[PDB]
Amino acid sequence: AAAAMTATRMPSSGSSPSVPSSIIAEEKLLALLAELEALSRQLAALTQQVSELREQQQQ
Amino acid sequence: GSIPYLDGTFYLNHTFKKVSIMFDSSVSWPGNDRLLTPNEFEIKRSVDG
């Protein structure tokens, strides 16, 4: 009634960026698709000359 | 067996890599900077940078 009455008396907000580091970029990209063919070409050339041992030993 | 040349059963179309055309031994066709590489019609490529 008196004394104190003179003054006065959720779910999901879904953030995303959190506490990780900063990020950067560059545009000098992508030789790498050539080596996948270099590697599998030269791999064949190994077997090709293993065959050239065998095809001369068989003579 | 089937005779593709006579009956139309063509099955080796996937074996082409490229075709180039050249009139008069000089003028590459279609030329005119049309395609991404048509001084040659590149049908398919084994590696794609």
Side-chain angles (χ1 to χ4, degrees):
Chain A
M5 315 301 292
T6 67
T8 314
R9 93 78 189 68
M10 151 63 65
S12 155
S13 60
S15 172
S16 319
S18 301
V19 204
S21 309
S22 188
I23 295 101
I24 46 163
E26 51 185 14
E27 297 282 353
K28 274 281 182 60
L29 310 188
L30 254 62
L32 298 172
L33 301 184
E35 282 80 356
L36 282 152
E37 210 191 53
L39 293 167
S40 56
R41 279 169 160 205
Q42 289 170 338
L43 182 284
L46 318 184
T47 69
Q48 209 68 357
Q49 289 159 98
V50 177
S51 93
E52 292 274 62
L53 304 181
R54 294 177 55 81
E55 292 187 22
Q56 292 185 37
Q57 290 305 298
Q58 287 158 199
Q59 304 190 22
Chain B
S2 95
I3 302 178
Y5 171 51
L6 272 290
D7 72 33
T9 49
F10 304 115
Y11 69 95
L12 301 180
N13 295 308
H14 62 280
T15 70
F16 290 87
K17 300 175 184 179
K18 61 176 73 94
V19 56
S20 58
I21 306 186
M22 193 89 74
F23 290 92
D24 297 329
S25 77
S26 302
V27 181
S28 181
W29 190 95
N32 291 294
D33 195 20
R34 290 296 187 244
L35 309 177
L36 301 165
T37 64
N39 74 309
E40 289 141 33
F41 292 90
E42 189 158 278
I43 292 164
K44 69 180 186 179
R45 49 165 56 190
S46 58
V47 63
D48 185 24

